Design a protein around this ligand. Structure first.
Ligand SMILES: [Mn+2]
Length: 206
């Protein structure tokens, strides 16, 4: 399928995010995926609004790449494992069921929520849903942690029974501290919960 990977970060001075951007862009070039990257400074800078911004950036990606079938959001703290950069996304996940609108990933047993949306596949037919997710950013309880992640799991999922899958995260949302043993074989490696300087240091070793 036509896949558009999207992400974003501000400011440009944040080195780890420059590096993850580079690796994602390279990965897209290898497999012919579209790549959308939001470099603008957010107008709403509170923690909740920052987390929700992915559901606004997806519309940017849809406008730029109208032929997209699958949108793939990656946090700026996610990168493509160099060992696996020559392998397409479809070698790791089956996107053939026409009924699915979201592919998401758990973070068990080490995490704190049933899904981790640092990596999130959204079908083109869920763009109007993402518009709703964005609209909920300033309404309780969706404006409370974990924000868009809670909104997807607790607002969206109940309303689309059978049209989402929660997958093991070992290859596609491979949280570094939680699944160190799987990092080597992952496609998407997720530097979740760590500081900027810690991320800079990790990326230097990549
Ligand atoms: Mn993250």
């Amino acid at each position: 399928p036509c896949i558009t990977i999207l992400s974003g970060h501000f400011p440009k001075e944040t080195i780890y995010a420059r590096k993850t951007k580079e690796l994602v862009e390279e990965y897209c070039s290898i497999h012919g995926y579209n790549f959308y990257y939001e470099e603008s400074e957010p107008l709403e800078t509170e923690e909740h609004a920052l987390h929700f911004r992915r559901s606004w950036i997806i519309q940017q990606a849809a406008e730029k790449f109208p032929s997209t079938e699958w949108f793939l959001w990656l946090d700026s703290d996610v990168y493509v494992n160099p060992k696996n950069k020559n392998k397409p996304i479809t070698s790791f996940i089956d996107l053939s069921d026409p009924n699915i609108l979201y592919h998401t990933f758990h973070e068990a047993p080490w995490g704190s929520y049933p899904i981790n949306t640092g990596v999130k596949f959204v079908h083109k037919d869920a763009l109007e849903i993402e518009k709703i997710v964005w609209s909920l950013r300033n309404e309780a309880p969706w404006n409370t942690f974990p924000y868009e992640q809670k909104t997807v799991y607790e607002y969206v999922f109940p309303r689309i029974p059978g049209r989402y899958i929660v997958h093991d995260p070992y290859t596609l949302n491979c949280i570094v501290k939680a699944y160190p043993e799987h990092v080597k074989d992952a496609l998407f490696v997720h530097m979740c919960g760590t500081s900027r300087a810690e991320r800079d240091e990790h990326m230097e070793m990549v």
